[PDB]
Design an enzyme around this catalytic site. Structure first.
Site, PDB file in Angstrom:
ATOM      1  N   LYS A 191       0.076  12.321   4.448  1.00  0.00           N
ATOM      2  CA  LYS A 191       0.319  11.393   5.551  1.00  0.00           C
ATOM      3  C   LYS A 191       0.887  10.094   5.016  1.00  0.00           C
ATOM      4  O   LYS A 191       1.830   9.573   5.601  1.00  0.00           O
ATOM      5  CB  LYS A 191      -0.970  11.132   6.348  1.00  0.00           C
ATOM      6  CG  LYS A 191      -1.485  12.388   7.054  1.00  0.00           C
ATOM      7  CD  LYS A 191      -2.639  12.085   8.032  1.00  0.00           C
ATOM      8  CE  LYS A 191      -3.225  13.325   8.674  1.00  0.00           C
ATOM      9  NZ  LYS A 191      -3.545  13.087  10.115  1.00  0.00           N
ATOM     10  N   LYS A 221       0.815  -1.200   0.000  1.00  0.00           N
ATOM     11  CA  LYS A 221       0.000   0.000   0.000  1.00  0.00           C
ATOM     12  C   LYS A 221       0.849   1.251   0.000  1.00  0.00           C
ATOM     13  O   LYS A 221       0.531   2.168  -0.740  1.00  0.00           O
ATOM     14  CB  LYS A 221      -0.987   0.004   1.165  1.00  0.00           C
ATOM     15  CG  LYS A 221      -1.917   1.211   1.166  1.00  0.00           C
ATOM     16  CD  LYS A 221      -2.778   1.342  -0.097  1.00  0.00           C
ATOM     17  CE  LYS A 221      -3.767   2.462   0.084  1.00  0.00           C
ATOM     18  NZ  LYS A 221      -4.391   2.855  -1.198  1.00  0.00           N
TER      19      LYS A 221
END
Lengths: 301, 296, 296, 301
Positions: C239, C171
């Site tokens: 983030k 991811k």
């Protein structure tokens, strides 16, 4: 040693650097020869006794030393090798000194073509700006034959302070590109730091004053750093010219397989400066592109 | 005049403490972390059990430890500085730590009656020994004036940037310049050597001009001579650059040179260089070009 | 077949949970954070007080929350998932969180008798609704086979990368590609529009060639049409890029494009764009050039 | 519509792209005219009936359409305007189609010089590589007059799949530079991601397989991504050629004031590749420069 006697020096390119350097040569007692081809000779120089001839060829014929202070690589080629240029007027016992900031790679070829006429070639670009040129405190980085260098050294002494033979032809221009990488990156370094400090509510003027005398001290911090804080961006050295200089470093890097990430990025930040109308701001205005990128200015204006 | 406490008498601490003794100051060391330098003991410094007993005795307490957690711990742990600090005492953090956390540490120190200055330095081990460090200070103007003669004994260029946190901010800004100035000299010398020019002669040629800097003079000479034994380790400068990059992310700043410099220090660390002096950033760029500016 | 718990039925959670119901699965929601989506309740989902009571009832418990602290809290807080989890139960974290922390969370979940899979997804709100998400999974092969039919109901390309943490690593790698592919289309379209060419025609012209990507098709169309309403917000992608940049600093990696992309998202945030869809990275580059590829 | 009838097409530059494209034109029933000036005509093309003439001038005289598939900007100038080049053989009712990947800015001037002979000009560079050229699946991005484009469209259809008129002259080359920025950056994107994954102990082959069908899916991920994992770096598209292409983007950025940080940086990473002997590796080998920078390889070899 010899050129404590008057010297016959031609000066091709009398700009913001050329005019004070030619003036300083005249104060050391030398004879200046100008070309009126592109521009009329400045009255300051004519008053001190400069002989205004019609073109670089005629200048090379009368003078022993021929200094070139023009903007870039193609302009040096044109001045050196066009019809009625320096090569057509040059021969034995003549020294062609290119003091422009041009390609080191091209310089080698220019040096060979000039030496093919029986003349000698020196590449002696400078560091110190307009203020340095007027003060005769310029750092002159020279490339050429050690005997040619020594012969021309009293002339370099009238125009500057630290004079150094870096190596053979092309080396003086390689030393100026290295200079140009430092200058542009030291500016980017001070701008990012003051932008960070001002963004955190610290007075950037106090920050710059605090950093002097430590590991972050430099001529860029005292000179450019003060311009960044005070907003005095009136050109000394234009962003468009520093972009020309970084293009030489980046072209060299592409040819010689160098990964120079900050030189590559300073070129992109200079483009942000140009995009907001800054090609003719002094290179210290590189902060304005970083301020544009941050949506925050370090000044109250 | 003045009784001074000193926590963190390491590579920078010991020479700074030494210069305070020469100036006529009584020192108080803490032997909790490790033994007190015999040089300081033989010169009059009193050894004490912890930073609380040091704070209790001294009116000025200087701190000089590696990072934000280590300052936090020595200030607020059981038997730390705060416990023994109070009215008329002044805590001076001369460590290079987060400007953000400093305002919180200062607030908690003032809650004891004590005052707080954040006064990090610049000039390496060399400047600490010779007392020529540039000391950037944040805090109350009256508190700065009180500590000023002590600062004068430890450094040369002393300056109050602003209120608490501003000294630490000046230090982050200093570390951005130190790393980026080191990379400018490294990129410039690698360009020169790659073009067949002598980097030693190019460094000499650039003095006196616009490319003149303390970095070209000290770190540039190390790059040419191959003298990379730590003064300031790469792993330490990487931590300093993270303070700048975390602050840029929080304050919506685009600092591409600083961000690139952090990635280059990472190449240095990958090729076995976490403990080299930050001048060995050239070694990372040299690896990136498969070409060194030196021989053998 | 299967009773499934679902914590985090937000923009991605609700459609993924909805597709599990259609497949013939009984859902168990937690109303601790907020009210259960009426769409799910009206379709058979049982509302419960907290993730412990959900874990107690269900054999599969899916989690879908914004970051590492939020996964940590919902797994290990009082009345969280671990308390009600045990033998034969399987915890599936489908959130995009730190690969580092995942190995620790997985270890603590296994200590209850339960199993753990880290299965983050790619394909936005659109792909969740249409069940075409690419699901990257880390964990035990037998545990992956058990959860596979549930994964098939939520996505199309299902793949076990490796053991626990490897799904989260895939991811982060996905988020590096998503941000950098978005910047490639933005730089390329800004170059084209700046040269007087139509960015709409250039995007159409590049289809079918080497420049073909899901990003050029979806995010490229948004750049040309000016449709920047969040699918995936910039503050969220910033983030995600920090997970990659922290990991690169720790593992001695030099990732200069990813580092530059983080600095560019910062310009977007500075000019009021923290909540724009990540396709509005072009707006940051456009600001950097004082030139937009669209009109008005 | 008309060029369902045989067409007279000249092909100047029969490389790894030119030869399959000329072959595909012949399969659509067209007449090919070659120049033997630099290289002999390939026997594959002569067997299919190509007429090998002596130079680009003769080719332009016999053929109605003249396609140029050469490496870079100066080579297009030389082929178009040297003695016995395409301009000397061109006139009315003739279409010069440059399918090379050259400067968009220069293309405008080439187009004007060619149109000054009564001929028309199209700039139609492609995307898809050698594999695309053989399959006739290339994406052809065209710049020129809409009637010239429509006239030449049946020919583009034999060589490619997605054919698009981006705009007037120079636009097809601007579309190829935009393509080149994407291709080089999508490669850098997949390399950084797989290097990060492999550094964390995740199998890069599984990672790439997992990313397909999601937001990180692309032709670069399926094609270049597999080469990165398997180490099959035998040139398809050389790093030296992609460095030529990025130089066009970066020169454009400098002239038009663009700050393109990742295009600037991919150029630096390609230089690390060249520094370790990679100018002739396929551009997917950009990962090898990142592996050099990380002191870590994603492969067991």
């Amino acid at each position: 040693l010899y050129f404590q006697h008057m010297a016959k020096i031609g000066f091709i390119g009398t700009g913001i650097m050329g005019k004070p350097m030619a003036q300083n040569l005249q104060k050391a007692g030398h004879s200046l020869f100008l070309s009126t081809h592109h521009d009329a000779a400045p009255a300051d120089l004519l008053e001190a006794g400069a002989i205004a001839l019609a073109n670089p060829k005629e200048v090379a014929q009368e003078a022993e030393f021929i200094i070139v202070m023009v903007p870039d690589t193609p302009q040096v080629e044109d001045v050196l090798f066009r019809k009625d240029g320096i090569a057509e007027g040059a021969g034995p016992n003549k020294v062609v000194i290119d003091m422009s900031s041009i390609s080191p790679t091209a310089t080698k070829g220019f040096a060979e073509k000039i030496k093919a006429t029986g003349a000698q070639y020196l590449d002696a670009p400078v560091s110190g700006g307009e203020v340095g040129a007027k003060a005769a405190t310029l750092s002159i980085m020279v490339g050429g034959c050690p005997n040619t260098f020594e012969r021309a050294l009293p002339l370099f002494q009238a125009m500057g302070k630290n004079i150094t033979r870096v190596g053979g032809n092309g080396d003086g221009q390689t030393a100026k590109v290295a200079n140009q990488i430092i200058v542009a990156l030291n500016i980017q370094a001070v701008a990012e730091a003051l932008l960070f400090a001002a963004r955190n509510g610290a007075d950037p003027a106090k920050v710059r004053e605090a950093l002097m005398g430590g590991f972050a001290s430099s001529r860029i911090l005292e000179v450019h750093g003060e311009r960044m804080v005070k907003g005095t961006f009136d050109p000394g050295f234009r962003i468009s010219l520093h972009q020309k200089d970084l293009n030489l470093a980046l072209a060299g890097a592409r040819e010689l397989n160098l990964n120079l990430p900050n030189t590559a990025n300073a070129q992109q930040v200079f483009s942000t400066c140009a995009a907001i109308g800054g090609s003719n701001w002094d290179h210290s205005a590189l902060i304005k592109g970083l301020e544009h990128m941050a949506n925050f200015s370090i000044r109250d204006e």
